[PDB]
């Protein structure tokens, strides 16, 4: 019902699956309680509308931000500029642009969020800590940013609405002289308007 790794880049259909499961269990409840066909239909309709009102705000923005907050992804909005900050320690393999597939939920979650702003413009920017030569950091950050841009485009985001850039240690959000700060430094920012 759902291919795990990006679901073949096809539109997810969890809502209809939940609604159908709820209609089925409502029909079961109607059959069990009343035992009449009309009672079964009434129970099925009640279960279907219950599943609707349940999965209807379970598929609203607030829960999506809460969920992607759960794995490792932080959402910061300011005015119209909204930023997703994603670590490259849980989402990219060691020193390689290869996307990490074991974290297929969270990345999928990201797409859902970006599909609430069909008219937006996406800036994807990669940052890495200070270690290594300048060219190394430049190339690695650019590769990670470009991989994220490709992933965003694959899920159904128009190719003109992207711009991917890789900065080295240029922009810093933590002190590189310490460990945990350097860990927070390595990231991908996805900004949109």
């Amino acid at each position: 019902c759902f291919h795990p790794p990006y679901n073949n880049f096809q539109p997810d259909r969890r809502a209809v699956k939940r609604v159908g499961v709820d209609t089925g269990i409502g029909a079961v409840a109607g059959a069990i309680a009343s035992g009449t066909a009309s009672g079964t239909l009434i129970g099925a309709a009640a279960g279907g509308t219950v599943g609707l009102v349940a999965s209807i705000y379970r598929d609203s923005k607030r829960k999506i931000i809460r969920d992607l907050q759960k794995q490792d992804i932080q959402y910061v909005e300011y005015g119209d500029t909204r930023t997703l900050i994603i670590p490259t320690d849980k989402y990219f393999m060691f020193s390689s642009p290869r996307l990490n597939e074991i974290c297929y939920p969270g990345l999928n979650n990201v797409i859902r969020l970006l599909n609430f702003y069909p008219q937006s413009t996406i800036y994807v920017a990669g940052f890495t800590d200070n270690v290594g030569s300048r060219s190394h950091k430049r190339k690695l950050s650019q590769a990670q940013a470009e991989t994220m841009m490709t992933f965003l485009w694959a899920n159904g985001i128009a190719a003109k609405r992207l711009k991917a850039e890789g900065y080295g240690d240029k922009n810093a959000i933590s002190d590189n002289a310490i460990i945990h700060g350097s860990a927070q430094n390595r990231r991908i920012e996805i900004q949109w308007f």
Partner: protein, 265 residues
């Protein structure tokens, strides 16, 4: 103060010319007011309990075709057709049969707006002609007794709203409601009381629907499955002297399931 501000600065959608055809099956039950709802009685120690018509549920249908054009302006032409033959056996000695026909043609100019990415509405105003009919016949156990009849036909406007809360993922919850006013001609003839009448009259009307819908996109257009419940009410429909009352409300309520196919150009 609203620090974030990307409001519904637009509500009128982009121009789009298209056609659409819709078919709906309707599982309703009709009722009247108290002046016609009760007939006959059972007597237990002088205790006279009146027997209601309690119309068994019947099935009607709706067809409608619409033409969409610049902005959210669309023209919808609709036919509602409902037939009912309901028996009422107040005792095994005699009973009655009711033939209730309701037909309605609705011409509709509607303006589509989307107050946000989620909530859309569609204001609609237009005209409606309705022909409504009641044929009631009594019978003994096998003797075919005569009944009376009351017909009406009228024309007049109709205006209301169309509130569709759409959450993305092709799903939505709709609530529609409107009010109509008709001027027309009604008549009634009673062979039991030997009384005839014919006159022009006024019928106000309120209708509403409420349910859930699902839109599936296709390369050539859109399909919409809508399932819900429907209510309507026509005021002061018939008139007859034989029955306990004189006037009669004409309302109906029932679930309904339908398909609507929209094709672009």
């Amino acid at each position: 103060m609203g620090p974030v501000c990307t409001p519904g600065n637009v509500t009128v959608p982009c121009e789009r010319t298209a056609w659409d055809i819709g078919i709906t099956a309707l599982y309703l039950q009709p009722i009247y007011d108290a002046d016609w709802g009760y007939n006959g009685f059972t007597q237990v120690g002088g205790w006279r309990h009146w027997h209601d018509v309690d119309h068994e549920w019947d099935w009607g249908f709706k067809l409608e075709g619409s033409y969409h054009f610049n902005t959210g302006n669309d023209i919808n032409v609709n036919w509602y057709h409902f037939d009912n033959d309901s028996d009422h056996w107040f005792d095994f000695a005699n009973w009655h049969n009711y033939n209730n026909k309701w037909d309605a043609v609705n011409a509709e100019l509607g303006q589509f707006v989307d107050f946000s990415a989620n909530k859309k509405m569609r204001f609609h105003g237009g005209v409606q002609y309705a022909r409504i009919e009641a044929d009631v016949n009594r019978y003994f156990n096998n003797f075919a007794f005569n009944g009376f009849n009351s017909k009406f036909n009228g024309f007049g406007p109709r205006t209301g709203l169309d509130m569709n809360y759409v959450f993305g993922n092709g799903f939505g919850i709709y609530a529609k409601g409107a009010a109509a006013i008709l001027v027309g001609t009604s008549d009634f003839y009673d062979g039991i009381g030997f009384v005839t009448g014919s006159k022009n009259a006024i019928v106000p009307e309120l209708e509403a629907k409420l349910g859930a819908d699902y839109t599936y996109a296709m390369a050539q257009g859109d399909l919409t499955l809508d399932v819900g419940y429907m209510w309507f009410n026509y005021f002061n429909a018939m008139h007859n002297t034989a029955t306990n009352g004189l006037e009669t409300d004409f309302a109906a309520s029932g679930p309904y399931i339908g398909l609507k196919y929209v094709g672009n150009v």
